[PDB]
């Protein structure tokens, strides 16, 4: 499950990066910062796609890859981390 | 469910970008797109509504319009996404 | 329920509309539309609070509001526009 | 809960004020006001990690602290906050 959904994620972040590093011009590092902080709704406070192609893939991008990432945050902290910490809790 | 969602949605994305056009100036794709990151509350790092009647209403679609976004999205990602991932884990 | 969430959402939002416009200076819209962006986390894409008696109000005034906020607006979607949709789906 | 809660999201604020502030230069109270925007996922609009160090980083701790984050501001909520208000609200 955690697998399948960190293979999802990772797949969807590639797609992102490979787009704006392609259609927006951005370093790969600069593209996969702008997908991760899309998708988990941070936002970025200083780049807006500036072509009407990333404008309309961004918007599609947003629905689609909303729903796996936060899915992921919520196994990879509930499946991942809380056991390290609730056994870790134990005396 | 998922049918009255998406059309929901499209409705409420329809009325952003046509106040966002009329009422800030915006390009339709860029009220449109202003919108989307608004009410799926990624936001935008550059614009920000320069009226005061633009002010206002932005404050009264991210109320109304947050819960039936993500209730799109909730089902998007639980009953269109999850099975065809679900049922493609089947060897 | 919902009366109660309104009014607290409703209180919550004066008091940032009185602490941006006094510390941060802002005009009473300005500062009641920052502290809106900010609790529904959607942000704001122009401004941050510049004083450090701002920045750890607004440190403060998230993780105390955030919760709240999002409780109205779960309310909102599903004990006052849910059915609204729901009855109104009824042939 | 709360408790272990409550120092592990102190833990993990600690750690990107100390990391933002040596890496990209903020001075503490800035770095620390980034690291709670931005795990709240609220944002900030003027400020993005300007080295790759800095993105990197940024990528790993929403990852890692968005999901601790919320399941404090859970319970901050349900937990503290409810009560206060729930039997509060008893006549
Ligand atoms: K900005
Ligand atoms: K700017
Ligand atoms: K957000
Ligand atoms: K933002
Ligand atoms: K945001
Ligand atoms: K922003």
Request: net charge negative; hydrophobic share 50%; no cysteine.
């Amino acid at each position: 499950e955690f697998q399948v959904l960190f293979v999802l994620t990772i797949l969807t972040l590639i797609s992102g990066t490979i787009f704006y590093s392609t259609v927006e011009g951005l370093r790969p590092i600069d593209a996969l910062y702008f997908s991760v902080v899309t998708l988990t709704t941070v936002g970025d406070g200083n780049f807006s796609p500036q072509t009407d192609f990333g404008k309309i893939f961004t918007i599609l991008y947003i629905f689609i890859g909303i729903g796996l990432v936060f899915g992921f945050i919520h196994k990879l902290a509930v499946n991942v981390q809380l056991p390290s910490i609730l056994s870790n809790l134990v005396p």
